[PDB]
Amino acid sequence: CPDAVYTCRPGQTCCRGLHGYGCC
Secondary structure, eight states, X not given: OXXXXXXXXXXXXXXXXXXXXXXX
């Protein structure tokens, strides 16, 4: 999931981004 190191908001959805994974 994107919530591994990056910074996002609580309750985000694991959405495959350009860097492999990103917060929806």
